[PDB]
Each structure stands twice: as C-alpha cells, then as structure tokens.
Amino acid sequence: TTDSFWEVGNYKRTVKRIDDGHRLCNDLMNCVQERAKIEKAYGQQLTDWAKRWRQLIEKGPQYGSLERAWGAIMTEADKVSELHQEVKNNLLNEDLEKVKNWQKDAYHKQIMGGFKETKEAEDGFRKAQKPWAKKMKELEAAKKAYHLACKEEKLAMTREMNSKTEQSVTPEQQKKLQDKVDKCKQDVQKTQEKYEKVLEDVGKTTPQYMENMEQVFEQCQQFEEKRLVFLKEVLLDIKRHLNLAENSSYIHVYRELEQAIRGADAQEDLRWFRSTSGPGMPMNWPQFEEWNPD
Amino acid sequence: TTDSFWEVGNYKRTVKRIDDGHRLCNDLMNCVQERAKIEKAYGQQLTDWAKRWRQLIEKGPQYGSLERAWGAIMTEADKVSELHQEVKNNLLNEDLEKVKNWQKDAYHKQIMGGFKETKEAEDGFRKAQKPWAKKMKELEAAKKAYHLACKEEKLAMTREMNSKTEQSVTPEQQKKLQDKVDKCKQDVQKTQEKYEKVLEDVGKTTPQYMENMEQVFEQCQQFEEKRLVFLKEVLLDIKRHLNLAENSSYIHVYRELEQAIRGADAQEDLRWFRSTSGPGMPMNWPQFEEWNPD
Ligand SMILES: [Ca+2]
C-alpha cells in the first residue's frame, strides 16, 4: 500500500482530479461540435438531394399525380434536413454553450501556476500533511538508526566469538571484544527507546492527521460533485436535442409524404393525358370550303 | 387545329410517353440510389463518431456512472447508424431492385432494334392512319383544283366583262372570251364534283379512322397505366423504408438513452472514488519493526 491516500504525497491523485475537470469539459465540448458537423452534413446532403431531384422531376417527362407524388419525397428530404439543422444548432447554441459557461465559472487560470481551485486544494493538502510529514521522517530516521544499532551489536557479539577462536596473544584485544559488545548494547537499548518514543508519538497525531486530510478532501468532493451534477444535466439536455422521435414534426413529415403518395390517381392521370394529348382534344374535321376569294 | 392528335401523324405524342416511361424507370432508380447512398454516409460518420469517442472517454479521466452515461450517447449514435443502413439496404436491396426487375419484365428491346413496345405502338398508329393518310392527300389536291378553277373562272368572266365596254373590237375576240368563260365554268363544276366526291367518302371512313385510332390508344394507355400503377406502389415502399418515426426501434433508442443517463449517480460515484482513491483506501500505519538479514 505505498500507493495509498494516507501515504505522504498521494493526495496528489485527487488533486489531479481537479485539473482533469476543466479538461473533460473541454472534451464534451469537442464531442458536441463533432456531432453537429455530422448533423449538418446529413441535412445539407439532404437539401442538395431535394433540389437536384426537385428540378429533375419538373423538367422531366413525368406528369400528373404521380409527378406530384414522386414530388413530395423531396419535401421530406427538405423537412428532415431542417430538423437535423435544428439539432446541429442546439448542440451548438445551448448544449455546447452551457458547458463553455459552466467551465468559465468553476475554473479560472492564474498567471503563475495552474488553476486557482487546484492550488487552494494543493495547499490545503500540504497544510494538513505538514505535521504528519515531519514526524514521518523522524520515524524512518529512528528506525534507520535502531536497525543500524542492532547490526553493530551483531557485528561485535559474534566477532568476539570469532576473535576468541584465535586464542593467540590478545589479552588487550580480548578486552576490546567485551568493550564494544557492551557499548553497542547501550546504543540498541537507547535507540529502541527513542524510536519507540516517536512511534507512540506519531500514534497520538494520526487522528488529527486523519481529521485533517479528511477535511480538505470532503471539500474536494464538494467541487467534484458540483461538476458531476451539472454534467449529467448537460447529457440529458443533449439526448433531448439529439432525439428526433417523440418530436411531433418528425412523425408529421412521414404522414404527409404518405398521403401525398396515395393521393396519386392514375385514372385522372390517364384521363388528363387523353384530353390533353389524345383523342380527347378537339379536332377540326374536313369541311366544305368556298373560295375566299381574298 | 393542326395541334390536335388526329391531324397528320400526331399519334407520336403518346408514342413518346411509351418510351418516356423507360428513362423515368432509370431516373427513379438513380433518385433512390443517390439518397440511399446518402443514408449510408450519415451512418458511417456516426459509427465512426462513436467508435472514436467511446475510445476517447474510455481512456479519459472521466469515470463511474457519469462516464458510462456520457458513453451511452456513443451507443445511440451506433444504434442510429444501424437504422440508417436498413434505410439504405431497403432502398438498394428491395426498392431499387423492384424497378430493375420490373423494367426487364415490361421493356424488351427488340434487337437494336428499338424498344419492342415503342416500335409496336408506332406500327399500330402507322397502320391505323396510312389508309386515311392518303384520303387527305387526295382531298388537299382535290380542293386545290376547285380553288384553281374558281380563280381562272372569275378571271375570265371579268375579262369578258372588262371587254364588253371596249368597242371596237371585235366579235371574234368577243366570242373567244366567251369560250374561255364557258370552259372555265365547266372546270369549276368538274373540280367541284371531284372535290365533293373525295369529300363525302372521307366523311364515310371517319368513325372507322376514329375508332381504328383509339384501338392502338387503349393499347397505349393500358401500358402506361401498367407503370403509373407500379410507380404509385414503389413510392409507397420507398416511403415505408424511409420513415423511422413509425419505427418502434428508433423511439426506443432514446427511451434507452434517457434511462441510461438518469441512472448516473454523482453520489455513488463520489463514494466510489473515495474508496478506490481516497481516505477510504486501506492504510499501513507505522508499527514497531525488527532486525533482519536480507
Ligand atoms: Ca476511465
């Protein structure tokens, strides 16, 4: 657990959380316009289709009702395109804009450093960790000293046993073997009293450490929460604006196309042609013609 | 007037219609192809736009139930794409292939060779007028003659008469101008007879031309009715496929999206971060250690 929140210098992860917040806003904005582009393309593709074929049918050999039928399928194209433009718009007028604004209130860059709120936190954390930071260094100092002190007690306590294995003219060196082994014995007992002293000491200051880091933290959560809430609301706003269905207009388009079509009557059609281009049209039959004369 | 269909070879007016319907078959094809090609374009941008973001937010700082939620939009895109494909397919697989399948069943080309149906219409009209075609050749000249005699006739009279007040002279020249006049009054009657004969016989083969023309006509209006019936149905197929509002699937995509998002829980998420990255994380508090060789 060297990667735990309580380990000195780890609150940083949640400090990052903040710089991230602004960045994700950024992201949602880029997502939105991208959507728009797509929505603009479709409906712009649409009217370009409506026009081409509107003109084609009107210049064309088609006639009568069938012409108007096949006609209406261009207004569809148009109406739908107008919707997808409605859609583009909102993504860009409301939804996008909302984010751009919210992001302008929550975060503010500062000339020296990053965001203001990022600092306020970053300092809050240091502040609450300072005390525990100091102590925690004492601690690893004393351990470091005490271990060393126990390594030396084993440096001479066994060495004496190796030096008295020589048993060769060392009455002055036999006194040093029992001199250092009892000197280091002092160190060990001492360091274990100092180190142990810090240990119980740190234990008296952990709650305070805890209340502390836990206070700057809940304050962080507060701010996070403020964007998480907003963000959800944005995403609803978007779904709303993306949704064509449950939009009267949309359904309306395809009822209107439908009846235009069924409206087509080949009979009336056929009759028109008869009267307009066929035997139905008047004919001057040969008649006895006198001289003009001029 | 010379506009009417009975006159000369104005049968052509509907002999065109017969072939007009061919290219109309073509046009519909492409009008559908184009748009059906347009549907595919939208869908591809979408699929790409989800694939591309799903990624981004996957590997971005956003987490918990708000990421998943914002993700939920990518999957409305994906789903919306899939529907636009059905629109395309249905356009190419069914509709565009109905007019193709239809066109081969009712438009056999008669070995270069015009369109078997046109050339057969044309013959139907050539043959029903050929007979009456020469009865109007006989009549145009048979009146040209009567008119000619009627001119040289009053020309000779008024020369017998413009002469009657010139004396001298002479009795011989006065009998000559009297011959011409008598002779000219004969031509008038002879040519007026002929004309009148070619006339009442033309008035005899009238209902027989009238009704021998309208035979080919119903042959020609039955085969235009053959498609204006078809066309009406395809414009009902194309409308079907094109509509999503009346697609249970579409409207579900957005009931689906609204469920997805509402589900998001800031709280739950906050708590989650708190346990996976905050004070909730398990800590290894300082404890008394011992001495130990590697
Ligand atoms: Ca993630």
Curated annotation (Swiss-Prot), chains A, B:
It is found in: Cytoplasm; Cell projection; Synapse, Synaptosome; Cell projection, Ruffle membrane. GO terms for molecular function: cytoskeletal protein binding; identical protein binding; phospholipid binding. It is a peripheral membrane protein. Residues 161-180 are annotated as: Disordered. The modification Phosphothreonine is found at T170. The keyword Cytoplasm applies. Highly expressed in brain and, at much lower levels, in heart and pancreas. GO terms for biological process: actin filament organization; cytoskeleton organization; negative regulation of endocytosis; neuron projection morphogenesis; plasma membrane tubulation; positive regulation of dendrite development; protein localization to membrane; protein localization to plasma membrane. Its main location: cytoplasm. May form heterooligomers with other PACSINs. Interacts with MAPT. Interacts with TRPV4. Interacts (via SH3 domain) with SYNJ1 and WASL. Interacts with DNM2 and DNM3. Interacts with both COBL and DBNL. Identified in a complex composed of COBL, PACSIN1 and WASL. Interacts with EHD1 and EHD3. Homodimer. Interacts (via SH3 domain) with DNM1; the interaction is reduced by DNM1 phosphorylation. This is Protein kinase C and casein kinase substrate in neurons protein 1. The lineage of its organism: Eukaryota, Metazoa, Chordata, Craniata, Vertebrata. The chain holds residues 15 to 308 of 444 of the full protein.
